[PDB]
Amino acid sequence: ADYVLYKDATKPVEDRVADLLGRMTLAEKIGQMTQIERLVATPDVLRDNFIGSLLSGGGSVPRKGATAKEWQDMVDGFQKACMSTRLGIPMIYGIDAVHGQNNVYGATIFPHNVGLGATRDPYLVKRIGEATALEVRATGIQYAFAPCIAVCRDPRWGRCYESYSEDRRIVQSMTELIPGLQGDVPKDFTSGMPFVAGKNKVAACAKHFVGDGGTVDGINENNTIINREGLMNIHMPAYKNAMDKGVSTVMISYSSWNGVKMHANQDLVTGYLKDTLKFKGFVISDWEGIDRITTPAGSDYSYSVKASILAGLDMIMVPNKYQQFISILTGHVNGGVIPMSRIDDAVTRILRVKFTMGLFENPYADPAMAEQLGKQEHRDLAREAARKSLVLLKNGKTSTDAPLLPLPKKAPKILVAGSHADNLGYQCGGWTIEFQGDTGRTTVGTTILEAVKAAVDPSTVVVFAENPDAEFVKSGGFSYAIVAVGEHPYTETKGDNLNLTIPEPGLSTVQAVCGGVRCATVLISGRPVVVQPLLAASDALVAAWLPGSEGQGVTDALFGDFGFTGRLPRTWFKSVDQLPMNVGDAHYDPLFRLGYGLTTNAT
Numbered sequence: 001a002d003y004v005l006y007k008d009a010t011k012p013v014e015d016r017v018a019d020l021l022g023r024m025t026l027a028e029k030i031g032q033m034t035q036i037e038r039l040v041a042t043p044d045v046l047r048d049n050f051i052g053s054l055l056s057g058g059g060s061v062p063r064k065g066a067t068a069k070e071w072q073d074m075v076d077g078f079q080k081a082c083m084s085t086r087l088g089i090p091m092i093y094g095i096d097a098v099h100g101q102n103n104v105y106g107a108t109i110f111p112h113n114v115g116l117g118a119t120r121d122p123y124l125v126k127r128i129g130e131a132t133a134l135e136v137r138a139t140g141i142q143y144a145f146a147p148c149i150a151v152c153r154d155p156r157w158g159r160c161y162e163s164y165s166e167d168r169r170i171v172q173s174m175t176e177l178i179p180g181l182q183g184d185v186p187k188d189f190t191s192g193m194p195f196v197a198g199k200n201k202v203a204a205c206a207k208h209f210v211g212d213g214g215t216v217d218g219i220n221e222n223n224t225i226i227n228r229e230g231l232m233n234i235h236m237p238a239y240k241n242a243m244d245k246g247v248s249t250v251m252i253s254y255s256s257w258n259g260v261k262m263h264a265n266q267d268l269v270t271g272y273l274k275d276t277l278k279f280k281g282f283v284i285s286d287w288e289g290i291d292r293i294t295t296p297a298g299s300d301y302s303y304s305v306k307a308s309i310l311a312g313l314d315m316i317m318v319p320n321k322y323q324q325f326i327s328i329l330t331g332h333v334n335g336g337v338i339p340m341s342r343i344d345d346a347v348t349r350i351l352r353v354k355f356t357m358g359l360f361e362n363p364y365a366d367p368a369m370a371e372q373l374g375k376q377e378h379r380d381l382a383r384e385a386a387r388k389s390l391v392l393l394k395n396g397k398t399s400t401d402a403p404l405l406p407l408p409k410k411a412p413k414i415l416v417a418g419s420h421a422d423n424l425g426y427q428c429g430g431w432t433i434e435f436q437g438d439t440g441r442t443t444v445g446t447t448i449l450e451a452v453k454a455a456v457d458p459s460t461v462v463v464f465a466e467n468p469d470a471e472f473v474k475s476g477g478f479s480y481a482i483v484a485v486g487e488h489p490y491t492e493t494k495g496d497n498l499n500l501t502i503p504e505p506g507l508s509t510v511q512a513v514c515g516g517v518r519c520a521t522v523l524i525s526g527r528p529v530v531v532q533p534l535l536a537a538s539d540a541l542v543a544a545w546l547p548g549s550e551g552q553g554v555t556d557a558l559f560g561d562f563g564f565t566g567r568l569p570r571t572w573f574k575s576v577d578q579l580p581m582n583v584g585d586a587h588y589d590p591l592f593r594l595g596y597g598l599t600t601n602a603t
C-alpha cells in the first residue's frame with residue numbers, strides 16, 4: 001500500500017537516487033550538500049535543516065577516553081535525528097582515519113604514509129585499509145577522509161609525512177588503500193563509479209585534488225608553481241588509479257593551480273575530474289575551503305558559495321556556520337544564480353554514494369563491531385608495517401667494522417636513551433588523538449623502551465635514561481645502546497621547523513651515548529631531516545619515520561627477528577639549500593638517493 005521505491009533495497013541504485021531526488025524540496029536538497037561538525041550538531045539542527053553529513057575534525061571527540069560504544073552511541077543519536085525527517089535520509093559521518101582510526105582512544109595507530117611508501121608493499125597497505133575500515137566501523141563511522149595521495153615535492157611541507165612518496169608511481173601503487181577501506185570493486189566495474197561493499201567497509205576519499213604536494217618551500221600556503229604536466233604527469237595520475245578502484249569521494253585542495261583556487265576551479269573539478277575521468281561519486285570541500293577562495297578568507301561568503309558550487313563541488317564541509325551556508329545557497333538558487341541542475345547533480349552524487357554503500361539499509365552502528373577497535377590482529381599488522389617501513393641508513397662506521405645490527409637479545413646490561421625512546425605521542429606524530437598529535441601515553445601502544453624490555457632475554461638488564469651525560473654512559477657497563485630522537489608532532493601550519501633540524505636535546509644525546517658505547521640511533525621523523533651529524537656519531541642509524549602505536553615493529557628489526565627491507569621513499573638531501581630536490585632533478589645531488597636502504601638478514 002505505502003511502497004516508496006527509494007526505500008526498496010532490491011531496486012537499482014540509480015533508480016533509488018532518481019526516485020528520492022524527485023521527491024525532495026530545495027531545503028532537503030541543500031541539506032544533503034551540507035556537512036557540519038558534531039560540535040554544532042543537535043537533533044533539532046539535523047532534522048530542521050535536513051543535514052546530509054557530520055564530521056569530527058581533528059580532536060573532535062565525545063570525551064577524552066571515549067570507548068567504541070560511546071562513539072557508536074554519539075553517531076547513532078545523530079542518525080536517529082536524521083532518520084526522523086520527512087524523507088528519512090541517513091547522514092554519513094566522516095573522520096580523518098588517516099593512519100588507523102587515529103582520533104579514538106585505544107585505536108591501532110599505523111605508520112604514517114611516508115613510512116608506508118618505504119615498505120614498497122601495496123598489499124600491506126591494502127590490508128591496513130581493511131583493518132582501518134573495521135576500526136572506523138567499530139566507532140559507528142562510515143566514511144574516512146583517506147587516502148591522501150599528495151605527491152609531496154618538498155619535505156619542508158608540514159604534511160609531507162602524509163604523502164607516500166615524492167615519486168608518483170609509488171603513490172599510485174599505494175592507492176590500494178582504497179579497496180582495503182571500501183572493498184574490491186566488481187569484475188566489470190566502470191572506472192569513476194563509487195563503490196563500498198557494505199557495512200564492514202567505509203567510504204574513502206582521495207585527497208586533496210589536485211597538486212597539494214606541489215612547490216613552493218616546502219609546499220604549504222601555495223599554489224603549485226608547476227604547469228600542465230607537471231600536473232598530468234606528477235600530481236594527477238594517482239587520481240586515475242583512484243577512479244579505477246571506485247573511490248567514493250574526492251576532497252578538494254586549499255591550493256591553487258595556475259593561479260586558480262582549486263575550490264573555484266571549474267575546469268579541473270567539472271571539466272577534468274567529473275567530465276574526463278567520469279567521476280560519479282561526490283566532491284567535498286576541505287574545512288572552510290570555500291571561505292578561503294577569497295582574501296582574507298571569509299570576506300565574501302556569498303561569492304565563496306557561488307564559486308565553489310558552480311565549480312562543481314557537491315558537499316561543503318562548512319563546518320560550523322551552517323545557517324549562513326544554507327541561507328546563502330538557498331538565496332542563490334531562488335535568484336537563478338545557481339541552477340537547479342547543479343543542485344540536482346550534487347544531490348544525485350551524494351545519494352549515489354549513500355545508496356551504493358548500503359547506508360539506507362544499515363544506517364546505525366553495529367554493536368558487535370565495537371571490539372574491532374584496537375584488536376590485537378590489527379596491532380600485529382601495524383607491527384609488521386612499522387618493521388617494514390624502517391630504512392637502515394648505516395650499520396657500521398667503517399667497512400672493517402662488525403655490523404652492529406642485529407643486536408643480541410642477551411647481554412648483561414644495555415642502555416635505552418633519548419627523548420623518543422619512551423614517548424608514544426612522538427612515535428605516532430600528528431593526526432593522533434588530536435589533530436596536532438601530542439606527547440606521552442595518549443593511547444594504548446608500546447614505546448621503543450617497552451618493546452626492548454619485551455624482546456630481550458630475562459637476564460638482560462635494561463636501563464633507561466632520557467638524556468644521559470657522557471660519564472653516565474661510560475661508567476654504566478653497557479654492551480650497547482639504542483638511542484631514539486627526532487621530530488615532535490606537527491602539521492602544515494604548526495610546529496613545522498623549515499630548517500629541518502631535529503630539536504635538542506637530540507643530537508647532544510646521540511653524541512653522549514655513542515661517544516661511550518656502540519649505539520643504534522633510531523630517528524623518528526615525518527621526512528628526511530639534516531642527518532650528517534647523527535650519522536657521524538652513530539654506529540648504526542635507522543630512519544623509522546612515524547611508526548605508530550606498535551613500537552615492537554622497531555625492535556623486531558633491531559634484534560634480528562626480521563631483516564631490514566625498507567627503502568627510502570624520498571630523496572635524502574645533503575642540505576636544505578638544495579630543496580626542492582626530487583628524483584629526476586637536473587642537479588640531483590642527494591646524501592642518499594630515493595630507493596636507498598641497507599639490509600640485514602633475520603638472526
Ligand SMILES: OC[C@H]1O[C@@H](S[C@@H]2[C@@H](O)[C@H](O)O[C@H](CO)[C@H]2O)[C@H](O)[C@@H](O)[C@@H]1O
Nearest residue numbers: 056057058096145207208251286287435
Ligand atoms: O579534518 C577535516 C579536514 O581538515 C583540513 S585541515 C583544517 C585547517 O585547515 C583549519 O584551519 O583548521 C581545522 C581544525 O581542525 C583543520 O581541520 C584538512 O586539510 C583535511 O585533510 C581534513 O580531512
